[PDB]
Amino acid sequence: MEQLLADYKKGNVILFVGAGVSMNLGLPSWSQLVDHIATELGYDPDIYRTFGSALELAEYYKLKKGKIGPLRSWMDRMWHSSDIDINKSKVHEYIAKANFPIIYTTNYDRWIETALSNYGKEYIKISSVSDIAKIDNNKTQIIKFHGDFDDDSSIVLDETSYFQRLEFETPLDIKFRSDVLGKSVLFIGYSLSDINIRLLFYKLSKLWKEQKLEEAQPKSYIFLPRPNPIQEEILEQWRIGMISSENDNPGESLEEFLKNFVLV
Amino acid sequence: MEQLLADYKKGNVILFVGAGVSMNLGLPSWSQLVDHIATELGYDPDIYRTFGSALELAEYYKLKKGKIGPLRSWMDRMWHSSDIDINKSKVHEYIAKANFPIIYTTNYDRWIETALSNYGKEYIKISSVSDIAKIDNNKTQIIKFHGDFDDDSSIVLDETSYFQRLEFETPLDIKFRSDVLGKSVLFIGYSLSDINIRLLFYKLSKLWKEQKLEEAQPKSYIFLPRPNPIQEEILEQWRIGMISSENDNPGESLEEFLKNFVLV
Amino acid sequence: MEQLLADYKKGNVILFVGAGVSMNLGLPSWSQLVDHIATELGYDPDIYRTFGSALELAEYYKLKKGKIGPLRSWMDRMWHSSDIDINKSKVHEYIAKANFPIIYTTNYDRWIETALSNYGKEYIKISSVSDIAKIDNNKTQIIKFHGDFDDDSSIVLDETSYFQRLEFETPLDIKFRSDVLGKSVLFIGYSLSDINIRLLFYKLSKLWKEQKLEEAQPKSYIFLPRPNPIQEEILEQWRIGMISSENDNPGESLEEFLKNFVLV
Amino acid sequence: MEQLLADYKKGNVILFVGAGVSMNLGLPSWSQLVDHIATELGYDPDIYRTFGSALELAEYYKLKKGKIGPLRSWMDRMWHSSDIDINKSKVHEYIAKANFPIIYTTNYDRWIETALSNYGKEYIKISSVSDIAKIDNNKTQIIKFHGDFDDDSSIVLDETSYFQRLEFETPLDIKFRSDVLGKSVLFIGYSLSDINIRLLFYKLSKLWKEQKLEEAQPKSYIFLPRPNPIQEEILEQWRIGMISSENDNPGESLEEFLKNFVLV
Amino acid sequence: MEQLLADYKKGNVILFVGAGVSMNLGLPSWSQLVDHIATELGYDPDIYRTFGSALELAEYYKLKKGKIGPLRSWMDRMWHSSDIDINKSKVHEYIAKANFPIIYTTNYDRWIETALSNYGKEYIKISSVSDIAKIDNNKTQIIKFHGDFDDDSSIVLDETSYFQRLEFETPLDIKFRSDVLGKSVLFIGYSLSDINIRLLFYKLSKLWKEQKLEEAQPKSYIFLPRPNPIQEEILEQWRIGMISSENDNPGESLEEFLKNFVLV
Amino acid sequence: MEQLLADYKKGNVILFVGAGVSMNLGLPSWSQLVDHIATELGYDPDIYRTFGSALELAEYYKLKKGKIGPLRSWMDRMWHSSDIDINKSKVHEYIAKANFPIIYTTNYDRWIETALSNYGKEYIKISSVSDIAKIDNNKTQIIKFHGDFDDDSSIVLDETSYFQRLEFETPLDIKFRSDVLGKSVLFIGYSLSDINIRLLFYKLSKLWKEQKLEEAQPKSYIFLPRPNPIQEEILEQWRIGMISSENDNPGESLEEFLKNFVLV
Amino acid sequence: MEQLLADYKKGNVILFVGAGVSMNLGLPSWSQLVDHIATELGYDPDIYRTFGSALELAEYYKLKKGKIGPLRSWMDRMWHSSDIDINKSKVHEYIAKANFPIIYTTNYDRWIETALSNYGKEYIKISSVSDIAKIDNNKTQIIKFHGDFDDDSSIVLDETSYFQRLEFETPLDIKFRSDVLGKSVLFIGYSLSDINIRLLFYKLSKLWKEQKLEEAQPKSYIFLPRPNPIQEEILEQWRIGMISSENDNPGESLEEFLKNFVLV
């Protein structure tokens, strides 16, 4: 809690913005993408929910249509609607105004870069290998961990693609497990039912405990608004700080936790 | 479907028994164990059930009370009660009268071995490395994949060991990865919800792809009690046949599926 | 003799029930256990009754099989048979009826706690660190000094495990050498052919003559069925008194001693 | 932090007070004691101060006088003077109004017991082996860890006695090493320059590390007036918190820390 | 010359016949292979042998030709000449008359199978996936680890192919990694100046170390004709018992070492 | 050749300094180190040179003694003598005057760092995880890939350590595998008769081929003083250019190779 | 000045040189090590000095850095500078010209070994177990008690390493506890404001008391430059004779004290 801020004033905290920071903008949820896949595939909406998880239906779309392209066009049109204003959302305001050097994200949308444009910052938005060559150390790096809408070969929308990225062998993951060296990672917007966060924590835990790294490697931190007595212990097995808030609505909890970083 | 019988008549089929072959046996469910963990941990069992999935609750009954010892002693008493009759189960009788030379099982109990013992089939139980040296090619190998109650250092009964065994490098995993070579695996009793079965299929599909084995290794199979048009193509990506039936009763479908394997 | 009853009547005595108490139950002896280890290892039982003492064969089982567990399951199955009835053993009946604050046991089986629950008493049975946290001053404490079948990491059958227990630094012996302070401890069921009993007496005598506790620590006692002239003086050199009886049959001697210890 | 109050509701926290918890009472310090030994021994204070530390001068009272008894009577005379009022001190009131079942004290005084008896709580005083037979398990066990003013043989004043008590083999030290099992220990009134303090946390960490017991035994805590990142990261290797508030003056810092322990 | 014969009496020894086992037959060396490659490529052989190692020189003729084929045909013709007879080589006789159930080999020639055919034994030679399905239990399995002349794709002659086989993911590599479980490996015909017979040892060292196989899987052994204390002490860290002989000629040394195995 | 200087002008190249870059200084070779190990271990040098490869002997020194400590002290004292000066060597001058932003080295010396400090350039030495947190991106990151003389636990002198570092999982290897993304690697000072600088090439080629990335990541390069068509055509499969000049003496070829990188 | 000269002429005196004999050498003190740690850690040195004593502050730079390597590399370079001449140091000259058979030292520098080499004597310097086998009997043994700059694992700079060395169980302390039997140990260069010369004193005192040694093992002695009757009387309980001097300069007192020892 205090150690996260002590590493933050040294510039040693990597943000890992999830999908839970955009619950106040008004983006379409995952129950709408599956609805659109059901509508344009030929099925019925509420019949195409019992048939699998939230990502293997997108995998079925990718094998029956051959591409994520017509899906990516609809998600780019619907996520980046003109109705959404980012000047009203305090979470992206405090993300942009804070001094975060690297802002790794598993979002597909371009609202973090829009928030950083809206407040004067500059970015080197990374989504593949060729964006790592254009890097610079004067401005921020927002790294689309799960691919941007500027690709069909880099969007991790599938189950096959998800299980491929769970091995951490693609060049966007070697960059992560080398950027993690010597720095803490702050996670915001995950509900701890996301399996990739758990295997990421497990991989960082064996990286720390197999190479006999001491406290020169700071651990990492996570924020979830609901305090859980058992998840603090399970995450502390993986060297993960449990930071929570007593507010009932998660929105002001995330707003205040990011307000803690916004001072300079 | 017929290719499964063509491989089975040649003795080239590995069985992989899941948890769904003992639905009619009256075994205690996955919720009464959480109720017992809650009552032995100091929680009311209606809010301890909402703290996570069953693996990350039986992991909390490993962090404090640092053993799965009393948990094993309770599940060995409750899952092998005197009210369960294995002769009244048609599925275990149909498994016992078949000609599977190697049977894998994820279950911790011993009802498959009891079913073989009550029908004259002489077996060998394999649970660790030391039992592999006691192998014999004239007896059926019951390889307890996720451990059993004859140890507490090998039961996969927590999130940490489950995510460790997802990387197939333990000796039972290597034994499975070499038993799969040149043979097909029949999976019975499995659902599809974030379990290791999909990662197993994906690993075997990678072994098919990068080693360029065209038809030397036959396609392995799964059985589902209800048909799913999504999962048939989803698993056909991973070289998996999805055998289903027309009976709405899930209990009656499995015995009618094993009846084709009984007479050989 | 009368001083032991005087320390009893103020609740300042500790029971230390051992392996020599259950001779009337009909439990398997160690001669059957080494026969089972010989059968499961591949030797001949009569060539395995030699080759070492009674504990290093179970140590060799830990060496070859790699785990206590398969042996632990057999001892749990054979020791707790349905043929053994605790209602017919008068010694366990007299142990359960007589009040005792702490009932330290060397035994692995659960027949003492079964005897206490057969006669209405309640137990807060301790075999690890985490069971000390749930301790209660109104319930009888039966502390398994050598562990029970609810753990394979605490059962002492190895000679290495025995010689590690002989240093008295695991947290099941710090509790004992703090429970000794100010109280006497009564021993029933030992023949003084075990090293740990005499070294425990030597440790308590060192604690008495080294910290100059004088007569503030009560003299503690040990029961035997056959009186010995030499061992009384050797034990009195350790401030340890021997209580014996004139009955040649050990069962009637133990029954009469515990009948003296029941009263109300 | 929050885990300490989580362990409080289960009754798993042992208080361990020191000299710094009694600085607002106004008792004589060690400097006037050194002045007393300089006056009694025929020395002069400004040459007898420089000739060593505080405890070597009590060792040089037990040397060249025959007994620590006159120094104990001096301490009983004006270390328990009539000018000191308990009721005007807030920290002793918050200690006495708390729900601590076991309280350890290295002060040789009775003002903790005076505060407990003044506010209606019942206590038992432990200073040797003979007081452990009077527990009754209903009153707050005030355990004088470093002796008391009613026994000249069990007080810890010298350097020989202090260095002998660093091996943790006395009956009070064995009692502490058994009471720590499964329970957290809260340290108050310590300046973290005390050698016994840092060897005590090293002994508890050695007990935690050698026997491989997990978080079934919780983590101990210590309160400090001023924060220190060096000591926090050093004590984190011993699984110890650094619960502290800045709050300028140290007098109200202990009161503000103890304010969380009254209505619980 | 150890407990290797005790393991061999139970049938838990896997032979790993190398390239130095057949120096008495008179097979062509790698120098004449390099000379033939130089002659067919146009280079002067005295010039060409200094242009790299033998593995890179056999990576050429796969590069600049496109196929192993003509080189495989020349090696099959020259390695199996009529001037080579098994019946005058006692080492292959002792290999054929022993009771090794699995005989791994990195040779390409068929003189091991010819030796077993000349002395009555029957073999189920394995060189790919589809021969693993043909295993008939009570037959010796000569597993060609580095391919043979019955395959142009599965042969291991290159540098790229040899570095592919160092990552143990090919099906024969998994078959070895699962055959090694619970059994010992005896290596005959290596010189330790060649790689992969140290990478096997390191991989088995991590397999027994990380999975904590406390002699569940026994030690493996190697035979060398020239004793060396440095290699014995280094191989002890990989628990490899380096067996040596005092005989000057390696042929009679290996002959006597296998004569120790040919009994019964 | 031309594309190397095309990547150089954008600052997209990485130096990988070898051990053959410093043959003109006059440092002790491995012969003197092996003779010192033989002298310290009691053997003759000429019988110790024939006992194994040059790293197995240091592995034996570490095994027979307790540490690599005195060997590291002797190597620090002998390899950094006052006779060796940077200013009379032109290769280190051309390395210091060039514009390599990241310099990798497998040398244990500091003569690269002494050359960069002598010519007024500023550098940051990286040898573990804790030095990665001091980048500041305005300084030449000299990275000791094979440890340094400022460490006794990360210096790669063994064969166990060498074969462990060949699997590319330590944090320096992860840092290299992320630094290589989108950049070219120049290899100077390697003879291509060593194993690490073939397996690294195969790892980079596997990363290029498996992820199916185009020319966004450029090709790596290597300089040797003598040309080799065999090694050129083998390296071109790994997407590697071979730079060479005839130039007779190997000392001059490196000077006229790094002359092209000076004035940029 | 006492009978230790008669013990010396029989060769029964062991030297135990500390850090106090190098006051006139001009080596950097511990305070400069604190400023170096503060400079290389980021803190202001005047701020950093007040955050604890020197030992925990040297435990930092192992915590938060991972290794003692860079600290050892700085200390070796700064403690062995060319400005220090051992020929002009007279205390080291009288130590070198004396007849001490075994010389223990808690220093890290090699100046005693350089003093022996500059005056004809030969040292067999011991820092770990592997040097104890190197003892060639008729040579002076400079056993470095607190490690050397040769290795980083065994150097004692930490608080945790200091508390490990306080419990005398590492092999160098076993060698000291056997070397002191029947001989006297003469301490020079200590001040008793430090530790280890409390338990090094108490342990031999209680060894002499508890095993009833009377005149078999002689008294052991210590020199201080400042006389103190309190410390002499305290140490005489540990059977120690302090030799003091009336000279004002601390250097000349030790100089004449060893000038006493130079004769034969």
Coordinates of C-alpha atoms in Angstrom, one line a residue, chain B:
Chain B
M1 CA -17.8 -43.1 -34.2
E2 CA -17.0 -46.2 -36.1
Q3 CA -13.3 -45.3 -36.2
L4 CA -13.4 -45.4 -32.4
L5 CA -14.6 -49.1 -32.6
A6 CA -12.0 -49.8 -35.3
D7 CA -9.3 -48.6 -32.9
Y8 CA -10.9 -50.3 -29.9
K9 CA -11.0 -53.7 -31.7
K10 CA -7.2 -53.3 -32.3
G11 CA -6.7 -52.4 -28.6
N12 CA -5.5 -48.9 -29.3
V13 CA -7.9 -46.8 -27.1
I14 CA -7.0 -45.1 -23.9
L15 CA -9.8 -44.4 -21.5
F16 CA -10.0 -41.1 -19.6
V17 CA -12.6 -41.3 -16.9
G18 CA -13.9 -38.0 -15.6
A19 CA -16.2 -37.0 -12.8
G20 CA -19.4 -37.5 -14.7
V21 CA -19.4 -41.3 -14.6
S22 CA -20.4 -41.3 -11.0
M23 CA -23.4 -39.0 -11.1
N24 CA -25.8 -41.7 -10.2
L25 CA -23.6 -43.2 -7.5
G26 CA -24.8 -40.8 -4.8
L27 CA -21.3 -39.5 -4.1
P28 CA -21.1 -36.2 -2.2
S29 CA -21.0 -33.2 -4.5
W30 CA -18.5 -30.4 -4.9
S31 CA -20.6 -28.2 -2.7
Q32 CA -20.8 -30.3 0.5
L33 CA -17.0 -30.3 0.6
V34 CA -17.1 -26.4 0.6
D35 CA -19.7 -26.6 3.3
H36 CA -17.4 -28.8 5.4
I37 CA -14.4 -26.5 4.7
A38 CA -16.5 -23.5 5.8
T39 CA -17.6 -25.2 9.0
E40 CA -14.1 -26.3 9.8
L41 CA -12.6 -22.9 8.9
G42 CA -14.9 -20.7 10.9
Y43 CA -17.3 -19.4 8.3
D44 CA -21.0 -19.7 7.7
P45 CA -21.3 -21.8 4.5
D46 CA -23.5 -19.5 2.5
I47 CA -21.0 -16.7 2.2
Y48 CA -17.9 -18.9 2.0
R49 CA -19.4 -20.4 -1.2
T50 CA -19.3 -16.9 -2.8
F51 CA -15.6 -16.4 -2.2
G52 CA -14.4 -18.2 -5.3
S53 CA -14.4 -21.5 -7.2
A54 CA -13.9 -24.8 -5.3
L55 CA -10.2 -25.0 -6.1
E56 CA -9.5 -21.6 -4.5
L57 CA -11.5 -22.6 -1.4
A58 CA -9.7 -25.9 -0.9
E59 CA -6.5 -23.9 -1.5
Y60 CA -7.6 -21.7 1.5
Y61 CA -7.9 -25.0 3.3
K62 CA -4.2 -25.5 2.5
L63 CA -2.7 -22.1 3.3
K64 CA -4.0 -22.1 6.9
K65 CA -4.1 -25.7 8.4
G66 CA -1.1 -26.4 6.2
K67 CA -2.1 -29.8 4.9
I68 CA -4.9 -31.5 2.9
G69 CA -4.6 -34.2 5.4
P70 CA -7.9 -33.9 7.4
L71 CA -9.6 -33.0 4.1
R72 CA -8.4 -36.2 2.6
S73 CA -9.5 -38.1 5.7
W74 CA -12.9 -36.6 5.4
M75 CA -13.4 -37.2 1.7
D76 CA -12.1 -40.8 2.0
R77 CA -14.8 -41.4 4.6
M78 CA -17.6 -39.6 2.8
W79 CA -16.9 -40.7 -0.8
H80 CA -16.5 -44.3 0.2
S81 CA -19.6 -44.7 2.3
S82 CA -21.4 -48.0 3.0
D83 CA -24.5 -46.8 1.1
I84 CA -22.9 -46.8 -2.3
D85 CA -23.3 -50.1 -4.3
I86 CA -21.1 -50.4 -7.4
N87 CA -23.0 -53.4 -8.6
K88 CA -26.1 -51.2 -9.1
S89 CA -24.2 -48.8 -11.4
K90 CA -24.4 -49.8 -15.0
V91 CA -21.7 -47.4 -16.1
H92 CA -19.0 -48.9 -13.9
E93 CA -20.0 -52.4 -14.9
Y94 CA -19.8 -51.4 -18.5
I95 CA -16.3 -49.9 -17.9
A96 CA -15.3 -53.1 -16.1
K97 CA -16.5 -55.5 -18.8
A98 CA -14.7 -53.6 -21.6
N99 CA -11.2 -54.2 -22.9
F100 CA -9.5 -50.9 -22.1
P101 CA -5.8 -51.7 -21.4
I102 CA -5.0 -48.3 -19.9
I103 CA -7.6 -46.3 -17.9
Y104 CA -6.9 -42.8 -16.8
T105 CA -9.1 -41.1 -14.2
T106 CA -9.2 -37.7 -12.7
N107 CA -11.3 -38.9 -9.7
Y108 CA -9.7 -39.3 -6.3
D109 CA -11.9 -42.2 -5.2
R110 CA -11.4 -45.9 -5.9
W111 CA -14.7 -46.9 -7.5
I112 CA -13.3 -47.8 -10.9
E113 CA -10.8 -50.1 -9.1
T114 CA -13.6 -51.5 -7.0
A115 CA -15.7 -52.1 -10.1
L116 CA -12.8 -54.0 -11.7
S117 CA -12.3 -56.0 -8.6
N118 CA -16.0 -57.0 -8.4
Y119 CA -16.0 -58.2 -12.0
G120 CA -12.8 -60.3 -11.9
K121 CA -10.6 -57.8 -13.8
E122 CA -7.2 -57.7 -12.2
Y123 CA -5.7 -54.2 -12.2
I124 CA -2.7 -52.2 -11.2
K125 CA -3.1 -48.8 -9.5
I126 CA -0.6 -46.2 -10.6
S127 CA -0.5 -43.0 -8.6
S128 CA 3.2 -41.9 -8.5
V129 CA 6.6 -42.9 -9.9
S130 CA 7.1 -45.9 -7.7
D131 CA 4.0 -47.6 -9.0
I132 CA 5.2 -47.2 -12.6
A133 CA 8.0 -49.6 -11.9
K134 CA 5.5 -52.2 -10.7
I135 CA 3.7 -52.2 -14.1
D136 CA 2.6 -55.3 -15.9
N137 CA 1.3 -55.6 -19.4
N138 CA -1.3 -58.3 -18.6
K139 CA -3.2 -56.2 -16.1
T140 CA -5.2 -53.0 -16.6
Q141 CA -3.5 -49.8 -15.5
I142 CA -5.7 -47.5 -13.4
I143 CA -3.6 -44.3 -13.5
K144 CA -5.0 -41.8 -11.0
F145 CA -4.2 -38.7 -13.0
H146 CA -5.1 -36.1 -10.3
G147 CA -3.8 -38.2 -7.4
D148 CA -5.9 -40.2 -4.9
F149 CA -6.4 -40.6 -1.2
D150 CA -3.3 -42.8 -0.8
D151 CA -1.2 -39.7 -0.4
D152 CA -1.5 -36.0 0.4
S153 CA 1.5 -34.8 -1.6
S154 CA -0.1 -35.7 -4.9
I155 CA -3.8 -34.8 -4.7
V156 CA -4.6 -32.0 -7.2
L157 CA -7.0 -30.3 -4.8
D158 CA -6.1 -26.6 -5.0
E159 CA -5.6 -23.9 -7.6
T160 CA -1.8 -23.8 -7.2
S161 CA -1.2 -27.5 -8.0
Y162 CA -3.9 -27.4 -10.7
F163 CA -2.1 -24.5 -12.5
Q164 CA 1.2 -26.3 -12.0
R165 CA -0.2 -29.5 -13.6
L166 CA -1.5 -27.5 -16.5
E167 CA 2.1 -27.4 -17.6
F168 CA 2.4 -31.1 -18.4
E169 CA 5.8 -32.0 -16.9
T170 CA 5.1 -34.2 -13.9
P171 CA 5.9 -37.9 -14.3
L172 CA 2.2 -38.9 -14.7
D173 CA 1.9 -36.2 -17.4
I174 CA 4.9 -37.6 -19.2
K175 CA 3.4 -41.1 -18.9
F176 CA 0.2 -39.7 -20.5
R177 CA 2.2 -37.9 -23.2
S178 CA 3.9 -41.1 -24.2
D179 CA 0.8 -43.3 -23.9
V180 CA -1.0 -41.0 -26.3
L181 CA 1.5 -41.7 -29.0
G182 CA 0.0 -44.0 -31.7
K183 CA -3.3 -44.3 -29.8
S184 CA -6.6 -42.5 -29.3
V185 CA -8.1 -41.3 -26.1
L186 CA -11.7 -41.7 -25.2
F187 CA -12.9 -39.1 -22.7
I188 CA -16.1 -39.8 -20.8
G189 CA -17.7 -37.9 -18.0
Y190 CA -16.3 -34.4 -18.7
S191 CA -18.1 -31.0 -19.1
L192 CA -16.5 -28.0 -20.8
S193 CA -15.9 -25.0 -18.4
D194 CA -12.2 -23.8 -18.2
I195 CA -11.0 -27.3 -17.3
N196 CA -7.7 -28.9 -18.2
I197 CA -9.4 -31.0 -21.0
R198 CA -9.2 -28.1 -23.5
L199 CA -5.6 -27.4 -22.7
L200 CA -4.9 -31.2 -23.1
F201 CA -6.5 -31.2 -26.5
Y202 CA -4.6 -28.1 -27.5
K203 CA -1.3 -29.6 -26.4
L204 CA -2.0 -32.8 -28.4
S205 CA -3.0 -30.7 -31.4
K206 CA 0.4 -28.9 -31.2
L207 CA 2.1 -32.3 -31.0
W208 CA 0.2 -33.3 -34.1
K209 CA 1.0 -30.0 -35.9
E210 CA 4.7 -29.3 -35.2
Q211 CA 5.9 -32.9 -35.6
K212 CA 3.9 -33.3 -38.9
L213 CA 2.3 -36.7 -37.9
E214 CA -0.3 -36.9 -40.6
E215 CA -2.3 -40.1 -39.7
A216 CA 0.2 -42.0 -37.5
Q217 CA -1.5 -40.7 -34.4
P218 CA -5.3 -41.2 -34.6
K219 CA -7.7 -38.5 -33.6
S220 CA -8.9 -38.9 -30.0
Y221 CA -12.5 -38.6 -28.9
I222 CA -14.8 -37.1 -26.2
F223 CA -18.4 -38.0 -25.2
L224 CA -21.0 -35.4 -24.3
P225 CA -24.5 -36.2 -23.1
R226 CA -26.0 -33.3 -25.0
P227 CA -25.1 -32.2 -28.5
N228 CA -23.5 -28.8 -29.1
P229 CA -23.0 -27.5 -32.7
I230 CA -20.4 -25.0 -31.4
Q231 CA -18.3 -27.4 -29.5
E232 CA -18.2 -30.0 -32.3
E233 CA -16.4 -27.6 -34.6
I234 CA -14.5 -26.0 -31.6
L235 CA -13.1 -29.5 -30.7
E236 CA -12.7 -30.5 -34.4
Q237 CA -10.1 -27.7 -34.5
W238 CA -8.2 -29.8 -31.9
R239 CA -8.6 -33.1 -33.8
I240 CA -11.3 -34.2 -31.4
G241 CA -14.4 -36.2 -32.3
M242 CA -17.5 -35.1 -30.3
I243 CA -19.7 -38.2 -29.9
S244 CA -23.2 -37.2 -28.5
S245 CA -26.6 -38.9 -28.3
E246 CA -30.3 -38.1 -28.5
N247 CA -31.4 -39.0 -25.0
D248 CA -32.2 -36.0 -22.8
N249 CA -31.3 -38.1 -19.7
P250 CA -27.6 -37.7 -19.2
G251 CA -27.4 -40.8 -17.0
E252 CA -28.9 -43.1 -19.6
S253 CA -26.7 -41.9 -22.4
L254 CA -23.3 -43.0 -21.0
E255 CA -24.3 -46.6 -20.4
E256 CA -25.8 -46.8 -24.0
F257 CA -22.5 -45.4 -25.2
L258 CA -20.3 -47.9 -23.4
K259 CA -22.6 -50.8 -24.5
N260 CA -20.9 -50.6 -27.9
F261 CA -17.6 -51.2 -26.0
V262 CA -18.9 -53.9 -23.7
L263 CA -18.9 -57.0 -25.9
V264 CA -15.2 -56.8 -27.0

